Design a protein around this ligand. Sequence first.
Ligand SMILES: OC[C@H]1O[C@@H](O[C@H]2[C@H](O)[C@@H](O)[C@H](O[C@H]3[C@H](O)[C@@H](O)[C@H](O[C@@H]4[C@@H](CO)O[C@](O)(CO)[C@H]4O)O[C@@H]3CO)O[C@@H]2CO)[C@H](O)[C@@H](O)[C@@H]1O
Ligand SMILES: OC[C@H]1O[C@@H](O[C@H]2[C@H](O)[C@@H](O)[C@H](O[C@H]3[C@H](O)[C@@H](O)[C@H](O[C@H]4[C@H](O)[C@@H](O)[C@H](O)O[C@@H]4CO)O[C@@H]3CO)O[C@@H]2CO)[C@H](O)[C@@H](O)[C@@H]1O
Ligand SMILES: [Mn+2]
Length: 210
Amino acid sequence: DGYFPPGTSKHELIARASSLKVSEVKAIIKKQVDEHWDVIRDVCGFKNKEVAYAFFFGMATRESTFRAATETGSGASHAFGPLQTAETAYANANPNYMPEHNVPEMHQYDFTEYNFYDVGISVHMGIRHFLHFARLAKEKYSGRDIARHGLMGYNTGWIDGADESWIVRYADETAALGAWYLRNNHMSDDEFTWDTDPRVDRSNPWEIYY
Ligand SMILES: OC[C@H]1O[C@@H](O[C@H]2[C@H](O)[C@@H](O)[C@H](O[C@H]3[C@H](O)[C@@H](O)[C@H](O[C@@H]4[C@@H](CO)O[C@](O)(CO)[C@H]4O)O[C@@H]3CO)O[C@@H]2CO)[C@H](O)[C@@H](O)[C@@H]1O
Ligand SMILES: OC[C@H]1O[C@@H](O[C@H]2[C@H](O)[C@@H](O)[C@H](O[C@H]3[C@H](O)[C@@H](O)[C@H](O[C@H]4[C@H](O)[C@@H](O)[C@H](O)O[C@@H]4CO)O[C@@H]3CO)O[C@@H]2CO)[C@H](O)[C@@H](O)[C@@H]1O
Ligand SMILES: [Mn+2]
């Protein structure tokens, strides 16, 4: 899963992440979806792999605008990378973080500076972390609600925490942003959208995925 060379320093990992082209970040995401398609499909029920690429492009857009060196927050809210993978995704981080032992199909990397700051590990771990919350959601939700409430867990820690406005502005927006890439033939190029971009169709945004 590691992208940059083993032993690369924090500041080099960050500089190199900031230099990745949109196309390069899309390729990292696609590789991880390819590797982990069976568990992604099993949990989320996405139609096919292409729409799963688009969903995770939607997450990259919503969380970082594809700026892979984005870093935010403190403690449980401290996140890095294109998907804003928080410390809580990682094994052997703070012992008070809620455990994520419900995704045996994906390696859970330990919390280390390489594993948190390397783009490859960060993307793998963000997918794993999302699946952790989507599986919490699947206990009570079906169809689009698995990914919709799984996203709310990803961002807030709680699948049912959020008010409708934030479900719309975070989860529905993620779905809409991801679909932009598929609908406009931007699955491999350097083009990107962004939260609230008026180019994006954000009406019935879950449609393409199922
Ligand atoms: O009560 C049960 C236990 O709770 C533990 O605290 C939880 C807390 O309740 C959750 O809200 C918090 O959730 C994190 C979540 O894990 C992260 O994925 C998320 O990451 C965000 C990321 C992606 O959107 O980007 C940010 O927005 C950038 O800032 C991140 O915020 O952040 C959520 C909010 O912090 O997780 C903690 C830890 O599991 C207590 O620690 C326990 O003592 C308690 O038993
Ligand atoms: O809270 C969830 C998540 O948020 C992440 O931060 C997001 C912001 O939520 C989101 O609003 C923000 O969107 C910006 C984007 O950064 C800009 O690049 C983009 O700029 C547009 C501009 O609005 C247009 O006028 C111009 O023509 O084009 C540019 C694009 O080239 O504007 C949007 C909307 O304001 O993106 C943030 C991510 O980059 C946090 O990072 C994350 O931690 C949170 O979990
Ligand atoms: Mn992987």
